[PDB]
């Protein structure tokens, strides 16, 4: 009915965080009152997220819920087009997300990528595709890692490029320095960053796209350690003047807020971002630091690695020293999560309610709206055919 | 905090349903549901979405406690029970008392004097009716029979009136334990009611065992319904407690009701908590009794119970529309707004409970003074008190 066509196209949400003049002290203390706003956001957003619980109780309705949520992905058809028409590889939704990030973030240099938690490899491939067709980089050097458990590389990007991947297979289990890619493990983060700086100087682009897979309303808290080792891997490897793209989620926990406060001292610009192709129904955010200003001191490295090693929830910094910054993160929360995500979660519920058994009919009603959003994406993020000689080597 | 200072009393919600002239045909065969059942499915999905919004607070008992404090803070009638109890010598002033009393004061029953109150313990419904009959109706004597799944009898109303109660203690397993999900007990209860009390002008049923609350209760509410319908005399009235009214069985049962009463309502008394889905189906002026077959078909329906509609729902479009409007008014609009309101109170006051109570106390008194003005109360004389053993 009406609601289905009035859908507004979404914007690349990009919220700058103000630069923090004072030096960094990793020390928590009496939290600033703004933390209360964030907890209200988290309660509210979990409330709206909790609305899909009844649907989760039976695998029948769960399946139909995710069909509906896939039906309101406004960009899925764009992936097939971009592959077929422009020779893009590994055109997952992450490819779209990375390519959109690279166009609108205007990075100074993306010619040397370390992509962490990358397993399929959309980010690498988008970076590759961007660097050749848009940045006209003579060559592209990259390294990647992903969690290789001793228990996936859907496109063969890992196995067809063993030199470019920094974790080790389960055949190297029992090695004293076995690095399975798990960035929740402090020694793996040291080793990964050491290994990257070795195959790659300088590293201009760090990306980290990891997420625990589980319950939906503890998602940020369940990922704090992963996302903290993601960040640490990047801050140990990224060169000065380098750039960082980290996948996050809701940003309401003090720890997350404190880690952003940490990020605030290392980059000249720092954005919380939500590409349009980042599914507005989820809480996923990408934290983007442009122009790394300086590297860790040996003390900062020690402390943060010790935190990752013996992890806990507590703020990394005194959060009341960053009132300005939390106000802008809160704006980002309000824009990305309390406004956009809640509306698109509500819209998704309304789609489930009215179409849970009429999936075909829902995709028929949205198809023109989908094309409008993919058209506008194609206008904003110019695409160019990638030359065979600059494809990635794929084994699948 | 304007959204606290413009809070206004709720209104008695009352949605008339159309009586069906067409002859009742109890269904033998499953049938293709009418498309309006989909809109009831959507109301159920939505109402469960908003209910689900409290799940995250449910997981950790620390925030669970705060949530129930918050829902207590927003219960606008919280102190009314005790005010009613002292001021007017009212008995068993549970919330069921207020609800039945409000029901009696709004629905303008032709007669409330020969009561069968089923699934009734501790006895607020009987008490409200006793209170209303003696202070408001002035019947010479009020005769009533009651039943309830054998105890809990928190006021000794059952212990002290063995003549009036139609279920039996476990020492009589020989037997009717007052479980209205058992067809034989339902028929038996009705017989017992019609023998101990002739005639029966008022039947009430207050039984209830969250996504499936309605569905978990279908059998119970069917038995409730059958017990009344098998014993409610002609011209008599019925008050049935329900919940969400979205399952096709429920709707089909309302359909059955529509053949037997001159008027038929879905109601949400203000003293029924606006945050829960509780409804009261009210039939006024029973026009006819079951035929023998209708009794056999319906009781057999309860004996080997399933979901399937009692009637062809597609022959009740009009009624079904009026029910939807009831669901729209009570559940999708009122109840969802009040749950939302509770969640908004939780977020802003989960740590400021005393403050929220301060904000709402003046409103709580205006709401309660309003209920007292709308449902006038008079002191109940001692010689008309029910006899209580506790
Ligand atoms: N603790 C951990 N350390 C490192 N990688 C992890 C991890 N837990 C999960 N991962 C990996 O992180 C990845 C996140 S999904 C990566 C998506 C990628 N941008 C794309 O091409 O689509 C998964 O492959 C998962 O196996």
Short mmCIF file of N, CA and C in Angstrom, two decimals, chain B residues 121-220:
data_model
loop_
_atom_site.label_atom_id
_atom_site.label_comp_id
_atom_site.label_asym_id
_atom_site.label_seq_id
_atom_site.Cartn_x
_atom_site.Cartn_y
_atom_site.Cartn_z
N UNK B 121 -12.33 -17.70 42.02
CA UNK B 121 -11.59 -17.43 43.24
C UNK B 121 -10.47 -16.41 42.97
N UNK B 122 -10.16 -15.54 43.93
CA UNK B 122 -10.65 -15.49 45.32
C UNK B 122 -12.06 -14.94 45.47
N UNK B 123 -12.66 -14.31 44.46
CA UNK B 123 -14.05 -13.92 44.60
C UNK B 123 -14.36 -12.44 44.46
N UNK B 124 -13.48 -11.68 43.79
CA UNK B 124 -13.75 -10.27 43.56
C UNK B 124 -14.99 -10.02 42.71
N UNK B 125 -15.24 -10.88 41.72
CA UNK B 125 -16.42 -10.69 40.88
C UNK B 125 -17.71 -10.86 41.69
N UNK B 126 -17.85 -12.00 42.39
CA UNK B 126 -19.01 -12.20 43.27
C UNK B 126 -19.14 -11.04 44.24
N UNK B 127 -18.02 -10.58 44.78
CA UNK B 127 -18.06 -9.53 45.79
C UNK B 127 -18.57 -8.23 45.18
N UNK B 128 -17.95 -7.79 44.09
CA UNK B 128 -18.46 -6.63 43.37
C UNK B 128 -19.94 -6.77 43.04
N UNK B 129 -20.38 -7.97 42.63
CA UNK B 129 -21.79 -8.11 42.29
C UNK B 129 -22.62 -8.02 43.56
N UNK B 130 -22.19 -8.72 44.60
CA UNK B 130 -22.86 -8.59 45.89
C UNK B 130 -22.91 -7.14 46.33
N UNK B 131 -21.77 -6.45 46.27
CA UNK B 131 -21.72 -5.06 46.68
C UNK B 131 -22.66 -4.20 45.84
N UNK B 132 -22.59 -4.35 44.52
CA UNK B 132 -23.45 -3.59 43.61
C UNK B 132 -24.92 -3.94 43.78
N UNK B 133 -25.23 -5.21 44.00
CA UNK B 133 -26.63 -5.58 44.12
C UNK B 133 -27.24 -5.00 45.38
N UNK B 134 -26.49 -4.98 46.47
CA UNK B 134 -27.08 -4.54 47.73
C UNK B 134 -27.05 -3.03 47.86
N UNK B 135 -26.00 -2.36 47.39
CA UNK B 135 -25.98 -0.90 47.50
C UNK B 135 -26.69 -0.21 46.34
N UNK B 136 -26.78 -0.83 45.17
CA UNK B 136 -27.23 -0.11 43.98
C UNK B 136 -28.54 -0.63 43.40
N UNK B 137 -28.77 -1.94 43.45
CA UNK B 137 -29.94 -2.54 42.84
C UNK B 137 -31.06 -2.78 43.82
N UNK B 138 -30.72 -3.05 45.08
CA UNK B 138 -31.70 -3.39 46.10
C UNK B 138 -32.57 -4.57 45.66
N UNK B 139 -31.90 -5.67 45.40
CA UNK B 139 -32.66 -6.91 45.37
C UNK B 139 -32.86 -7.40 46.81
N UNK B 140 -34.03 -7.95 47.11
CA UNK B 140 -34.30 -8.42 48.47
C UNK B 140 -33.16 -9.27 49.02
N UNK B 141 -32.88 -10.36 48.31
CA UNK B 141 -31.74 -11.20 48.60
C UNK B 141 -31.04 -11.54 47.29
N UNK B 142 -29.72 -11.64 47.35
CA UNK B 142 -28.89 -11.97 46.21
C UNK B 142 -28.39 -13.40 46.36
N UNK B 143 -28.78 -14.26 45.43
CA UNK B 143 -28.39 -15.66 45.43
C UNK B 143 -27.38 -15.88 44.33
N UNK B 144 -26.30 -16.59 44.64
CA UNK B 144 -25.24 -16.79 43.67
C UNK B 144 -24.63 -18.17 43.83
N UNK B 145 -24.10 -18.69 42.73
CA UNK B 145 -23.30 -19.90 42.80
C UNK B 145 -21.98 -19.62 42.12
N UNK B 146 -20.93 -20.27 42.59
CA UNK B 146 -19.62 -19.99 42.05
C UNK B 146 -18.89 -21.30 41.81
N UNK B 147 -17.85 -21.22 40.99
CA UNK B 147 -16.95 -22.35 40.80
C UNK B 147 -15.58 -21.80 40.47
N UNK B 148 -14.57 -22.61 40.75
CA UNK B 148 -13.20 -22.24 40.45
C UNK B 148 -12.38 -23.52 40.52
N UNK B 149 -11.37 -23.62 39.64
CA UNK B 149 -10.40 -24.71 39.73
C UNK B 149 -9.94 -24.85 41.17
N UNK B 150 -10.17 -26.05 41.74
CA UNK B 150 -10.18 -26.19 43.19
C UNK B 150 -8.90 -25.62 43.80
N UNK B 151 -8.99 -24.61 44.69
CA UNK B 151 -7.99 -23.74 45.34
C UNK B 151 -6.54 -24.15 45.16
N UNK B 152 -6.66 -19.59 44.09
CA UNK B 152 -6.73 -20.04 45.48
C UNK B 152 -7.69 -19.16 46.29
N UNK B 153 -8.29 -19.75 47.33
CA UNK B 153 -9.38 -19.15 48.09
C UNK B 153 -8.82 -18.25 49.20
N UNK B 154 -8.24 -17.12 48.76
CA UNK B 154 -7.42 -16.29 49.66
C UNK B 154 -8.23 -15.56 50.72
N UNK B 155 -9.56 -15.45 50.57
CA UNK B 155 -10.40 -14.74 51.54
C UNK B 155 -11.37 -15.66 52.24
N UNK B 156 -11.19 -16.97 52.10
CA UNK B 156 -12.11 -17.92 52.68
C UNK B 156 -13.53 -17.83 52.18
N UNK B 157 -13.74 -17.24 51.01
CA UNK B 157 -15.09 -17.18 50.45
C UNK B 157 -15.59 -18.58 50.09
N UNK B 158 -14.68 -19.47 49.70
CA UNK B 158 -15.08 -20.83 49.38
C UNK B 158 -15.32 -21.65 50.65
N UNK B 159 -14.40 -21.56 51.62
CA UNK B 159 -14.55 -22.37 52.83
C UNK B 159 -15.86 -22.07 53.54
N UNK B 160 -16.29 -20.81 53.53
CA UNK B 160 -17.40 -20.35 54.36
C UNK B 160 -18.76 -20.46 53.68
N UNK B 161 -18.80 -20.75 52.39
CA UNK B 161 -20.05 -20.86 51.64
C UNK B 161 -20.03 -22.14 50.83
N UNK B 162 -20.03 -23.30 51.49
CA UNK B 162 -20.06 -24.56 50.73
C UNK B 162 -21.32 -24.73 49.91
N UNK B 163 -22.45 -24.15 50.36
CA UNK B 163 -23.69 -24.20 49.59
C UNK B 163 -23.54 -23.56 48.22
N UNK B 164 -22.65 -22.59 48.09
CA UNK B 164 -22.62 -21.77 46.88
C UNK B 164 -21.64 -22.25 45.84
N UNK B 165 -20.68 -23.10 46.20
CA UNK B 165 -19.61 -23.48 45.30
C UNK B 165 -19.85 -24.85 44.70
N UNK B 166 -19.65 -24.95 43.39
CA UNK B 166 -20.08 -26.08 42.59
C UNK B 166 -18.93 -27.02 42.22
N UNK B 167 -17.71 -26.76 42.66
CA UNK B 167 -16.63 -27.71 42.49
C UNK B 167 -16.36 -28.39 43.82
N UNK B 168 -15.58 -29.46 43.77
CA UNK B 168 -15.37 -30.31 44.93
C UNK B 168 -13.89 -30.37 45.28
N UNK B 169 -13.64 -30.55 46.59
CA UNK B 169 -12.30 -30.75 47.12
C UNK B 169 -11.72 -32.06 46.60
N UNK B 170 -10.39 -32.20 46.62
CA UNK B 170 -9.80 -33.48 46.19
C UNK B 170 -10.24 -34.67 47.03
N UNK B 171 -10.72 -34.46 48.28
CA UNK B 171 -11.23 -35.61 49.01
C UNK B 171 -12.52 -36.19 48.41
N UNK B 172 -13.03 -35.67 47.29
CA UNK B 172 -14.21 -36.25 46.65
C UNK B 172 -13.89 -36.84 45.28
N UNK B 173 -12.62 -37.02 44.94
CA UNK B 173 -12.24 -37.77 43.75
C UNK B 173 -13.03 -39.06 43.95
N UNK B 174 -14.03 -39.31 43.10
CA UNK B 174 -14.83 -40.53 43.26
C UNK B 174 -14.61 -41.53 42.13
N UNK B 175 -17.17 -36.54 39.95
CA UNK B 175 -16.30 -35.56 40.59
C UNK B 175 -16.04 -34.38 39.64
N UNK B 176 -16.19 -33.17 40.17
CA UNK B 176 -15.99 -31.93 39.42
C UNK B 176 -15.02 -31.05 40.20
N UNK B 177 -13.78 -30.99 39.74
CA UNK B 177 -12.80 -30.10 40.36
C UNK B 177 -12.87 -28.68 39.80
N UNK B 178 -13.91 -28.38 39.03
CA UNK B 178 -14.09 -27.04 38.52
C UNK B 178 -13.13 -26.65 37.42
N UNK B 179 -12.53 -27.64 36.74
CA UNK B 179 -11.66 -27.41 35.59
C UNK B 179 -12.53 -27.33 34.35
N UNK B 180 -12.73 -26.11 33.84
CA UNK B 180 -13.68 -25.93 32.74
C UNK B 180 -13.10 -26.32 31.39
N UNK B 181 -11.88 -26.83 31.34
CA UNK B 181 -11.36 -27.39 30.10
C UNK B 181 -11.80 -28.83 29.89
N UNK B 182 -12.47 -29.42 30.87
CA UNK B 182 -13.02 -30.77 30.81
C UNK B 182 -14.50 -30.65 30.46
N UNK B 183 -14.89 -31.22 29.31
CA UNK B 183 -16.27 -31.16 28.85
C UNK B 183 -17.26 -31.66 29.91
N UNK B 184 -16.99 -32.82 30.51
CA UNK B 184 -17.93 -33.35 31.50
C UNK B 184 -18.09 -32.40 32.68
N UNK B 185 -16.98 -31.83 33.17
CA UNK B 185 -17.07 -30.85 34.25
C UNK B 185 -17.87 -29.63 33.82
N UNK B 186 -17.68 -29.17 32.58
CA UNK B 186 -18.43 -28.01 32.09
C UNK B 186 -19.92 -28.29 32.13
N UNK B 187 -20.35 -29.37 31.45
CA UNK B 187 -21.75 -29.78 31.51
C UNK B 187 -22.21 -29.96 32.96
N UNK B 188 -21.41 -30.66 33.77
CA UNK B 188 -21.78 -30.88 35.16
C UNK B 188 -21.94 -29.56 35.89
N UNK B 189 -20.92 -28.68 35.79
CA UNK B 189 -20.98 -27.37 36.43
C UNK B 189 -22.27 -26.64 36.07
N UNK B 190 -22.64 -26.66 34.79
CA UNK B 190 -23.86 -25.98 34.35
C UNK B 190 -25.09 -26.58 35.02
N UNK B 191 -25.24 -27.91 34.94
CA UNK B 191 -26.32 -28.60 35.64
C UNK B 191 -26.37 -28.19 37.10
N UNK B 192 -25.25 -28.35 37.80
CA UNK B 192 -25.18 -27.95 39.20
C UNK B 192 -25.64 -26.51 39.39
N UNK B 193 -25.19 -25.61 38.51
CA UNK B 193 -25.60 -24.22 38.59
C UNK B 193 -27.12 -24.08 38.43
N UNK B 194 -27.68 -24.74 37.41
CA UNK B 194 -29.10 -24.54 37.12
C UNK B 194 -30.00 -25.19 38.15
N UNK B 195 -29.48 -26.13 38.94
CA UNK B 195 -30.28 -26.78 39.98
C UNK B 195 -30.23 -25.97 41.28
N UNK B 196 -29.03 -25.56 41.69
CA UNK B 196 -28.89 -24.76 42.90
C UNK B 196 -29.43 -23.36 42.70
N UNK B 197 -29.57 -22.89 41.46
CA UNK B 197 -30.01 -21.48 41.20
C UNK B 197 -30.95 -21.36 39.98
N UNK B 198 -32.19 -20.94 40.23
CA UNK B 198 -33.20 -20.82 39.15
C UNK B 198 -33.95 -19.53 39.34
N UNK B 199 -33.90 -18.59 38.37
CA UNK B 199 -33.06 -18.79 37.19
C UNK B 199 -31.66 -18.24 37.37
N UNK B 200 -30.94 -18.06 36.27
CA UNK B 200 -29.56 -17.46 36.31
C UNK B 200 -29.56 -16.23 35.40
N UNK B 201 -29.39 -15.05 35.98
CA UNK B 201 -29.48 -13.79 35.25
C UNK B 201 -28.13 -13.23 34.87
N UNK B 202 -27.07 -13.70 35.51
CA UNK B 202 -25.74 -13.15 35.31
C UNK B 202 -24.75 -14.29 35.42
N UNK B 203 -24.01 -14.50 34.35
CA UNK B 203 -22.91 -15.44 34.32
C UNK B 203 -21.61 -14.67 34.15
N UNK B 204 -20.62 -14.97 34.97
CA UNK B 204 -19.31 -14.38 34.81
C UNK B 204 -18.28 -15.49 34.84
N UNK B 205 -17.14 -15.21 34.23
CA UNK B 205 -16.04 -16.16 34.13
C UNK B 205 -14.76 -15.35 34.05
N UNK B 206 -13.82 -15.62 34.94
CA UNK B 206 -12.67 -14.75 35.14
C UNK B 206 -11.37 -15.53 35.06
N UNK B 207 -11.35 -16.58 34.27
CA UNK B 207 -10.20 -17.46 34.26
C UNK B 207 -9.17 -17.06 33.22
N UNK B 208 -7.91 -17.29 33.58
CA UNK B 208 -6.81 -17.03 32.67
C UNK B 208 -5.63 -17.81 33.18
N UNK B 209 -4.95 -18.53 32.28
CA UNK B 209 -3.66 -19.15 32.56
C UNK B 209 -2.60 -18.07 32.39
N UNK B 210 3.77 -14.68 26.37
CA UNK B 210 2.76 -13.65 26.06
C UNK B 210 2.32 -13.69 24.58
N UNK B 211 3.19 -14.23 23.71
CA UNK B 211 2.83 -14.34 22.30
C UNK B 211 1.67 -15.28 22.08
N UNK B 212 1.54 -16.29 22.94
CA UNK B 212 0.52 -17.31 22.82
C UNK B 212 -0.49 -17.25 23.97
N UNK B 213 -0.51 -16.15 24.74
CA UNK B 213 -1.42 -16.08 25.88
C UNK B 213 -2.85 -16.42 25.45
N UNK B 214 -3.32 -15.78 24.38
CA UNK B 214 -4.64 -16.11 23.86
C UNK B 214 -4.74 -17.59 23.51
N UNK B 215 -3.74 -18.09 22.80
CA UNK B 215 -3.77 -19.47 22.31
C UNK B 215 -3.63 -20.47 23.45
N UNK B 216 -2.83 -20.15 24.46
CA UNK B 216 -2.73 -21.01 25.64
C UNK B 216 -4.05 -21.08 26.39
N UNK B 217 -4.91 -20.09 26.19
CA UNK B 217 -6.13 -19.94 26.95
C UNK B 217 -7.38 -20.32 26.17
N UNK B 218 -7.24 -20.66 24.89
CA UNK B 218 -8.40 -21.00 24.06
C UNK B 218 -9.31 -21.99 24.76
N UNK B 219 -8.74 -23.11 25.20
CA UNK B 219 -9.52 -24.15 25.84
C UNK B 219 -10.23 -23.60 27.07
N UNK B 220 -9.46 -22.96 27.96
CA UNK B 220 -10.02 -22.38 29.17
C UNK B 220 -11.18 -21.46 28.85
#
